[PDB]
From a paper:
In this work, we identify the dominant fatty acyl-CoA dehydrogenases (designated [name] and FadE2, respectively) required for growth of [name] on long- and medium-chain fatty acids. The resulting acyl-CoA enters the β-oxidation cycle, being initially converted to enoyl-CoA by an FAD-dependent fatty acyl-CoA dehydrogenase (FadE), followed by sequential hydration, oxidation, and thiolytic cleavage reactions. The [name] enzyme has a broad substrate specificity, being able to use both long- and medium-chain acyl-CoA substrates, whereas FadE2 exclusively uses medium-chain fatty acyl-CoAs. [name] (601 residues) and FadE2 (592 residues) had the same overall fold (with the backbone RMSD of 1.001 Å) as other acyl-CoA dehydrogenase (ACAD) superfamily members.
The putative catalytic base in [name] and FadE2 (Glu441 and Glu442, respectively) is conserved. We therefore wondered whether we might improve substrate binding by preventing catalytic turnover. This was done by mutating the active site glutamate residues in [name] and FadE2 to alanine. Similar to FadE5Ms, we noted that in the presence of bound C16-CoA, the side chain of Phe289 in FadE1E441A formed a π-π stacking interaction with the adenine ring on the CoA moiety of the substrate. Overall, six FadE1E441A side chains formed hydrogen bonds with the CoA moiety of the substrate, of which Arg454, Asp450 and Arg296 are also conserved in FadE5Ms. However, by comparing the substrate-bound FadE1E441A structure with that of apo-FadE2 (with no substrate bound) the analogous residues (Tyr440 and Tyr441, respectively) adopt an exclusively “open” configuration. In the structure of FadE5Ms, the tunnel that accommodates the acyl moiety is blocked mid-way along by the side chain of Met134; an obstruction that becomes displaced to allow long-chain fatty acyl-CoAs to bind. This is not the case in FadE1E441A, where the analogous residue is alanine, making this unplugging mechanism unlikely. To investigate this further, we superimposed the structures of C16-CoA-bound FadE1E441A and apo-FadE2 to compare their substrate-binding cavities. This structural alignment revealed that the FadE1E441A substrate cavity was deep enough to accommodate long-chain substrates. In [name], the corresponding residues are Gly129, Ala295, and Gln302.
Residue numbers in the entry:
A (entry chain B), B (entry chain B): 3 to 601
């Protein structure tokens, strides 16, 4: 019943963002031809629709089962992973040198989009493995790549990111897991990691943990953390799973959602590990993995909006309840389908505006990934790296926050039926809630965007995007079809720079102003990004209608969604502006001991 | 670990809303003296803290267990209900004539506030029974009151509201459950009701169902529905539970939350029932029950904000993570408590502003209930009835919507730990989600407020409240302590009438405009109500500080919370204004068949 949104994915990639010319321009991509790409997307869609989407409810109902022996995944999960590996999917967007198919990361990301929608909990197993692959590719030695990266690329082994300890998630500088150097050049790793997604499971031949730990007499805090490869089974002479390493799962968590993804307490009992990247540069190297996880979680945010929408539109066309305010629209039936109600249309259009808008932002970001990986033009590469660094926190926090809202609109359309397990809409909400907590909380994303990406680059990262918006407004300010979008967009674009300058000035007078403005500044930024993408989709829709498309309704719907976004969602920016400019004192003046005097 | 917010309840009731003079002015209340009332609140708080709050997690973990025989409640629920009945709580705010203690409904509501916070699922059992009591009091014959109302007032029997069928929740005019008249003046009731809260359980001696059904050859729709008393056990000659009636629970639902409250499919197999109220006036009579449920669900919204806050403040003071932007505040510790972070303070102050603000609105509404029930002044009674009709949909939808937001802020403060079952914060979110769906969805509340309460009274219901706000602004516009609140409040108060006039004009041109504006109009109205209550609490805090209170910190915190509300939450009104004035066409123009063309 999940259906992949292939027509919209093709609209965004090929029509909006010129993917054919993009792939034509990039080393290694010249063979990623439209017919090959469309066949790969279609095969991806079928796997998602036929194999893993039917396992989504099973994953939530059964969850994972711990024994000291290991962790059992839900019925069908491991069989589906066997089919995924047999179909070659893990190798799709990885280097030919390491057993990969060599296709662009942005094509892999489209498969990931559909996987995350069909079964997010299932998709975490291969998804975390992609982060581990990216880390080994960027920082691994030749031998670490020959041993571990080839096995991850085939899908035979999976990978995990091991950061969190009981006392620290955001504050990695406090981690205490220790790496004791051995004469043989290896390390013995001792410590307890918690909330390790896919830490233990029954789906693969080995698990490759990528682990943050401290060398003896390393500096205090983040300047003292190093990165280690700690496999569940140590490689044998033939490079296959060998001696059991001293890594074991103590327990799995009982959670609100993503039950199908084992959330593991992992005990490292002087486990053998291998240093990856330079000593004391573990944070820098682990950021390869963390940035993969942030873009992947943004895709999770998109997934919850998409699933919300799919459920909501089906129910709104089928469920009859009350009558239209302008007279019975189905007078032959006992009641009208509830899509006749304006408030139901508001909730449908909200989910649609966020799913379709975020899809545009995601594939825009995916083009930057391809440029950084493949371009020979140092200037093009620098610009793409700056744009990706800017969009990563916006995509993660904004898409997750509005994806949870969208999941909740999906429930709301079902009325009381939305609270019932059988329909899947409440699971979509429960699975969505972790998306704003893991991979860097919304607040951490917001500090990254405003502190590190915007204020610490003198706004150069922001200027990259506002230049695009400015050029779009200059080009479209007298275009009759979209001049209604350009006027507010140009006002917003000017305001975005002015706000940034006002927030920066406040931060110079009081550093608390960075945290005080951060989440409003990020949400404002995401709304502004989608104003640009909606205005551009409206521009493209009007062009296609003028050209005499045979898909008139598809493009007319884009113009309706764009107008709904600008008139009913974008005005949320007015509240983020007022809040962010209101100043840190209204947050910081209350004494800690005075917050709870009503008892 | 739940603590009743007794100091704040006393602040709102006695200091803000003059409850002592209120009770002094009302027939029957003159004995509800401050010392008696405070002892009752304290005993209420202890029951909640000691007996039912420790059962909240048990209720969620075990849920209810169906057998054809009946429905088992979670461990301890029925024992706690035995203690509640032995303590006399069910009879507290009911008529002496029917075995009641005769205390004001608004004092009962304070017990209900603490019950809903300690264990909402448990509280539903006595809470629905109060709705059944109110219905029997208003519409029952002497004999129906002697038989059923006395047993509900003692707590020996519980009560339910049976409306919903598989094909209809909001559209009661489509219900098909039939009542066949018998020669003995009784009716045989045949039909399946779904989502019957407390439909079957093991906690009481009988269950009194209040059931909507259709007489043979009644008019189409709501003009054809009648109300019936259908007990699980028919009364014997001594009025005690007698012959088993043909009422049985076919199944219970599997839901996202409120697991401790049995959500029952109830089969009426030509069950014996008794007409209550006039034939064909079932909707009018059932509204007594439905309005009790709407105010009770508003109290649920308050409960989720309160529990969110209690969990969040405890964690924010205890959890150490990262350091203040203005330098380590706890340099002796490995990290600062996370309350040093502005973004954590924003989430704490949001929950506090909604809990404390909604508490003020709730007890303001509770005074109207007391005036309608007890006043001999017809003019005072009319004004109170109008004010209660206006506030009921605002309280239900606004307090539930912002209570769910507040529950989610509670989770967010815990980071990844917030998703884990052991901490209770995720249960608070899951239990909160039903609050916007049952007792009339947010959208139904919004149509009731804008269509029935405001536009169909020519705004007289709104004018009742905006007159209070106007007089407050005239009184406080030069009061140095709160003039900063009055200026924006007076602008908002003028805007509230202007918006109402603009929305009414649009509705006259196109009736779709009522649904299109409805939810934004309700949320705007709730924010405006809390602007008034926060400005008034700030006024009262400044008065207490000028008087030389020994509780300086309590009142200083009220002023901080009020300023946080005005500067960071109230600007949400700017987005509701823009959206509501944007017009129905941006919702209604998209064709039904064009919403999902991206597949
Ligand atoms: C393609 C998709 C495929 C799909 C497939 C994906 C699916 C996959 C989904 C599964 C999802 C599960 C994911 C669960 C969650 C975890 O796996 S655990 C991850 C959760 N925790 C985190 O994200 C990190 C914790 N919190 C933070 O980020 C903190 O802000 C920090 C960064 C650790 C604070 O450290 P700090 O030392 O104060 O930081 P700071 O001084 O600002 O920077 C230190 C260095 O870090 C680096 N750095 C800092 N910020 C950044 C940044 N934004 N970027 C890069 N480097 C940075 C730099 O090297 C920097 O050095 P400088 O350049 O400043 O000299
Ligand atoms: C104190 C607290 C203690 C604590 C202890 C509580 C804890 C307790 C929590 C448990 C919580 C579980 C609760 C689950 C939920 C369900 O038990 S099932 C209830 C869910 N469904 C509903 O709420 C009702 C369904 N939806 C509606 O409200 C629809 O809008 C309607 C009213 C049925 C539409 O019917 P309609 O015939 O189109 O309505 P309309 O022509 O506007 O009005 C018809 C008549 O109804 C009456 N009426 C309409 N609106 C109203 C109103 N707002 N007010 C009064 N009468 C009205 C009037 O008699 C009216 O006649 P007119 O005065 O107009 O001539």
């Amino acid at each position: 019943d999940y259906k992949a949104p292939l027509r919209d994915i093709r609209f965004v990639r090929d029509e909006l963002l010129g993917y054919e010319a993009h792939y034509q321009s990039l080393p290694g991509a010249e063979d990623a031809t439209p017919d090959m790409v469309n066949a790969i997307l279609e095969e991806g869609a079928k796997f998602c629709e036929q194999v893993i989407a039917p396992l989504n409810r099973v994953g939530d109902l059964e969850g994972c089962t711990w024994s000291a022996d290991g962790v059992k995944t839900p019925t069908g999960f491991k069989e589906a992973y066997q089919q995924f590996v047999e179909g070659g999917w893990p190798s799709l967007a990885h280097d030919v040198e390491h057993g990969g198919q060599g296709l662009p990361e942005s094509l892999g990301l489209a498969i990931s989009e559909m996987v995350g929608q069909a079964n997010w909990s299932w998709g975490m197993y291969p998804g975390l493995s992609h982060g581990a692959m990216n880390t080994l590719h960027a920082h691994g030695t030749a031998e670490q790549q020959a041993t571990y990266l080839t096995k991850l690329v085939s899908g035979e082994w999976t990978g995990t990111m091991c950061l969190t300890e009981p006392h620290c998630g955001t504050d990695l500088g406090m981690l205490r897991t220790k790496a004791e150097p051995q004469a043989d050049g290896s390390y013995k790793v001792t410590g307890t990691k918690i909330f390790i997604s896919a830490g233990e499971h029954d789906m693969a031949d080995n698990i490759v943990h990528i682990v943050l730990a401290r060398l003896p007499d390393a500096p205090q805090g983040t300047k003292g953390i190093s990165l280690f490869i700690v496999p569940k089974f140590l490689p044998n002479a033939e490079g296959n799973a060998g001696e059991r390493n001293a890594v074991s799962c103590g327990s799995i968590e009982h959670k609100m959602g993503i039950h199908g993804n084992a959330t593991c307490v992992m005990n490292f009992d002087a486990a053998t590990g291998f240093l990856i990247g330079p000593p004391n540069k573990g944070l820098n190297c682990m950021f390869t993995f963390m940035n993969t996880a942030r873009l992947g979680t943004a895709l999770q945010g998109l997934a919850h909006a998409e699933v919300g929408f799919q459920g909501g539109i089906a129910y709104a066309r089928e469920r009859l309840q009350m009558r239209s305010l302008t007279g019975p629209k189905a007078p032959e039936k006992p009641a009208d389908p509830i899509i006749v109600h304006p408030d139901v249309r508001r909730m449908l259009l909200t989910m649609k505006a966020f799913a379709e808008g975020n899809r545009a932002m995601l594939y825009f970001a995916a083009k930057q990934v391809d440029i950084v990986q493949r371009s020979q033009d140092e200037e093009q590469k620098k610009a793409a790296d700056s744009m990706l660094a800017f969009l990563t926190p916006i995509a993660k926090a904004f898409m997750t926050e509005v994806g949870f809202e969208s999941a909740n609109h999906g429930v709301q359309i079902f009325g009381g039926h939305g609270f019932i397990a059988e329909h899947g809409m409440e699971q979509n909400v429960r699975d969505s809630r972790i998306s704003m907590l893991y991979a860097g909380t919304t607040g951490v994303q917001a500090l990254d965007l405003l502190g590190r990406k915007v204020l610490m680059t003198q706004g150069e990262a922001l200027k990259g995007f506002t230049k695009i918006v400015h050029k779009f407004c200059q080009a479209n300010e007298a275009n009759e079809a979209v001049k209604e979008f350009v006027a507010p967009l140009a006002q917003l674009n000017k305001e975005w720079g002015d706000l940034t300058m006002k927030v920066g000035m406040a931060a110079m007078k009081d550093r608390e102003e960075v945290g005080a403005a951060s989440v409003d500044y990020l949400m404002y930024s995401g709304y502004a990004c989608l104003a640009y993408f909606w205005a551009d989709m409206a521009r493209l829709a009007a062009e296609k209608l003028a050209a005499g498309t045979g898909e008139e309704a598809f493009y007319k719907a884009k113009l309706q969604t764009a107008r709904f976004y600008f008139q009913r969602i974008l005005p949320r920016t007015r509240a983020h502006v007022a809040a962010m400019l209101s100043g840190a004192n209204n947050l910081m003046e209350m004494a800690e001991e005075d917050f709870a005097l009503g008892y």
